């Protein structure tokens, strides 16, 4: 089981001995520092999961202190572990962290370079605890980056949907999470899935559903939805020469709901032209508007394959023209490109579809790796730094300012986020927020002395994270 005393970077175990003597306060903040996709604004999401799962309640025990002591004595080949400091938290506070965390509400969309959350110790003895928990808190970069990058792809889809159709109907289902297998772990799967679900309602990553339910909650039955679908194994197990039968059995089994059938197993073109287009057409043209056949390619160049499929289908099914003058497949027939989809290639497919006058109403996208795995902490320059210290009754504004990288320069003093008269955000430095020139601080206390003092519903988060779209 989890032990906070073993959930930090090794070197942090040694830091209590490095601060100026008589330091009573170490105050730190997190931001997405200002740097082909720009990501000028970020979705703040995921901290509440960290607060509940790892920082709330009795997190220090005598067994946990002892387990850490023996581990670090071997790991450092020396005694540097602060047994005294951890025992103090256990005796004085029943193992509850004397820490205060202030954060902007979850789901809020804030421009780059603004304070998102602050961390400070409430007990002078625990000056070292602020940066101990940097490691566990900085991991919030991941739900932040997934939610931000997913929202950016919703902007792309929203542009082209409206451009080629004049409406945003079913925008919530145009980007589907297929990333469960392509992530580093079961926990990353739940965190990442949940962050995509702030923007969309389509997910195959089940892990995300339980995480939202336990850490946020919803008034809705489920946070995300899926449809019956096929894989190479459920097609190929019939034998090459029985591909038609596989398709016939699958589409008949799921006739009252939409069904995705992967048709690239041997020859995507033959499957669309002959099998769906000739041989099984009678089962396809009969389907409900609420229950279409979603044809799925999974190989080759994403744009070219998508195009080639749409024309092959256009030449075997009645392709109507809309109010914007864009080619639209019949409702009982849809498409899903779930291969090689990331923010870049998604932009390319929808632009290439617009150029060949194909409506975005015809396709939905599936993304795995590019959605939940192909992201780093550099993408948004998610960083945690110390901005203020109190040593021997004196408070000072501290920061890093490396000569070779001015982008690595951090903020000074006590910070606050404010709403400007023009309706924007400004981060105030050096305690200037106390004057409330631009009203009250937008950061709220979300954690204080082992207690989660403010929680957000996933419904509030979704609303806060909405697209401007005007």
Ligand X SMILES: CCC(=O)N[C@@H](C)c1ccc(NC(=O)[C@H]2C[C@@H]2c2cccnc2)cc1
Distance in Å, CB of 154 to a second copy, minimum: 21
Q: Is 199 a binder of ligand X (CB under 6 A)? A: no
Residue 267 assigned ligand-binding role: no
**Is 317:285 a contact under the CB 8 Å cutoff?**
yes
The span from the CA of 299 to the CA of 181, in Å, is 18
The span from the CA of 171 to the CA of 364, in Å, is 9
Distance in Å, CB of 436 to a second copy, minimum: 28
Residue 298 assigned ligand-binding role: yes
**Is 357:162 a contact under the CB 8 Å cutoff?**
no
Q: Is 134 a binder of a second copy (CB under 8 A)? A: yes
Size of the site for ligand X (CB under 6 A): 19
Residue 440 touches which of ligand X, a second copy, none (Cβ within 5-8 Å per kind) = none
The span from the CA of 210 to the CA of 216, in Å, is 10
- Give 244: exposed, middle or buried? Use CB within 10 Å, 0-12, 13-18, 19+: middle
Q: Which is nearer to a second copy, 153 or 205 (CB)?
A: 205
Residue 408 touches which of ligand X, a second copy, none (Cβ within 5-8 Å per kind) = a second copy
Residue 209 touches which of a second copy, ligand X, none (Cβ within 5-8 Å per kind) = a second copy
Single out the residue of 254, 279, 395, 431 in contact with a second copy (rule: CB under 8 A). 254
**Is 33:113 a contact under the CB 8 Å cutoff?**
yes
Residue 339 assigned ligand-binding role: yes
In the stretch 188-227, what mask flags binding to a second copy with x, by CB under 8 A?
A: x--xx----------xxxxx-xx---x------xx-xxxx
Q: Which range binds ligand X by CB under 6 A, 86-94, 125-133, 224-232, 425-433?
A: 224-232
Q: Which is nearer to ligand X, 149 or 367 (CB)?
A: 367
The DSSP symbol for 20 reads: P
**Is 81:68 a contact under the CB 8 Å cutoff?**
yes
Element (H, E) at 158: helix 141-165
Cα Rg of the chain, angstroms: 26
Residue 21 assigned ligand-binding role: no
Q: Is 309 a binder of ligand X (CB under 6 A)? A: no
Single out the residue of 173, 238, 269, 399 in contact with ligand X (rule: CB under 6 A). 173
Torsion of CA 2, 213, 377, 402, to 10 degrees: -80
Q: Is 338 a binder of ligand X (CB under 6 A)? A: yes
- Give 14: exposed, middle or buried? Use CB within 10 Å, 0-12, 13-18, 19+: middle
- Give 138: exposed, middle or buried? Use CB within 10 Å, 0-12, 13-18, 19+: middle
In the stretch 156-175, what mask flags binding to a second copy with x, by CB under 8 A?
A: --------------------
Q: Which is nearer to a second copy, 178 or 332 (CB)?
A: 178
The span from the CA of 149 to the CA of 166, in Å, is 24
Compute the C-alpha angle 131/132/133, nearest 5°.
85
Residue in 132, 124, 130, 126 with CA at minimum distance from that of residue 393: 124
The span from the CA of 169 to the CA of 163, in Å, is 13
Distance in Å, CB of 137 to a second copy, minimum: 9
Distance in Å, CB of 367 to ligand X, minimum: 10
Q: Which range binds a second copy by CB under 8 A, 277-285, 315-323, 378-386, 461-469?
A: 378-386
Q: Is 260 a binder of ligand X (CB under 6 A)? A: yes
The pair of structure tokens assigned to 235 is 């097609």
Binding residues: 181, 204, 232, 296-298, 338-339, 369, 377
Binding residues for beta-nicotinamide D-ribonucleotide: 204, 296-298, 338-339, 369, 377
Binding-site ranges for ligand X (CB under 6 A): 9, 11, 173, 176, 178, 202, 204, 225-227, 229, 258, 260, 294, 296, 336, 338, 364, 366
């Amino acid at each position: 089981e989890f032990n906070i005393l073993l959930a930090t970077d090794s070197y942090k175990v040694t830091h209590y001995k490095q601060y100026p003597p008589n330091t009573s306060k170490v105050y730190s903040y997190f931001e997405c520092r200002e740097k082909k996709v720009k990501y000028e604004e970020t979705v703040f999401y995921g901290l509440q999961y960290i607060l509940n799962k790892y920082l709330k309640g009795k997190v220090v025990t005598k067994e946990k202190i002892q387990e850490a002591k023996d581990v670090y004595k071997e790991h450092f080949q020396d005694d540097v572990f602060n047994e005294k400091g951890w025992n103090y938290i256990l005796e004085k506070y029943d193992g509850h962290l004397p820490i205060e965390i202030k954060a902007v509400p979850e789901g809020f969309v804030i421009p780059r370079g603004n304070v998102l959350f602050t961390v400070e110790n409430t007990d002078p003895e625990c000056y070292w605890l602020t940066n101990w928990i940097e490691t566990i808190l900085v991991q919030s970069w991941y739900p932040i980056t997934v939610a931000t990058n997913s929202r950016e792809q919703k902007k792309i889809l929203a542009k082209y949907l409206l451009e080629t159709s004049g409406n945003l109907d079913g925008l919530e289902y145009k980007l589907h999470d297929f990333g469960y297998r392509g992530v580093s772990s079961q926990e990353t799967a739940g965190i990442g899935a949940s962050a995509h679900l702030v923007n969309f309602k389509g997910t195959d990553t089940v892990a995300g559903l339980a995480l939202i339910k336990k850490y946020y909650g919803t008034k809705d039955p489920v946070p995300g939805y899926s449809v019956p679908a096929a894989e190479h194994s459920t097609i190929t197990a019939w034998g090459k020469d029985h591909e038609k039968d596989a398709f016939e059995h699958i589409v008949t089994q799921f006739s009252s709901v939409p069904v995705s059938v992967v048709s690239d197993s041997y020859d995507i073109y033959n499957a669309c032209e002959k099998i769906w287009g000739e041989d099984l057409r009678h089962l396809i043209v009969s389907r409900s508007t609420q229950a279409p056949l979603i044809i799925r390619p999974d190989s080759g160049n994403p744009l070219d394959t998508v195009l080639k499929v749409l024309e092959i289908l256009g030449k075997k099914f009645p392709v109507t023209e809309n109010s914007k003058g864009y080619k639209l497949l019949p409702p009982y027939l849809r498409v899903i490109q779930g291969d090689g989809v990331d923010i870049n290639t998604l932009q390319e497919i929808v632009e290439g579809m617009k150029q060949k006058m194909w409506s975005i109403e015809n396709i939905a996208f599936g993304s795995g790796g590019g959605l939940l795995q192909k992201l780093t902490r550099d993408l948004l320059n998610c960083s945690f730094k110390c901005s203020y210290v109190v040593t021997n009754g004196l408070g000072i504004n501290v920061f890093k300012d490396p000569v070779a990288d001015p982008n690595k320069r951090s903020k000074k003093g006590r910070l606050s986020l404010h709403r400007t008269p023009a309706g924007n955000f400004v981060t105030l430095e050096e305690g200037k927020g106390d004057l409330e020139e631009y009203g009250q601080d937008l950061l709220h206390t979300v954690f204080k002395n082992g207690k989660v003092t403010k929680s957000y519903s996933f419904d509030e988060i979704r609303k806060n994270a909405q697209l401007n779209i005007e």
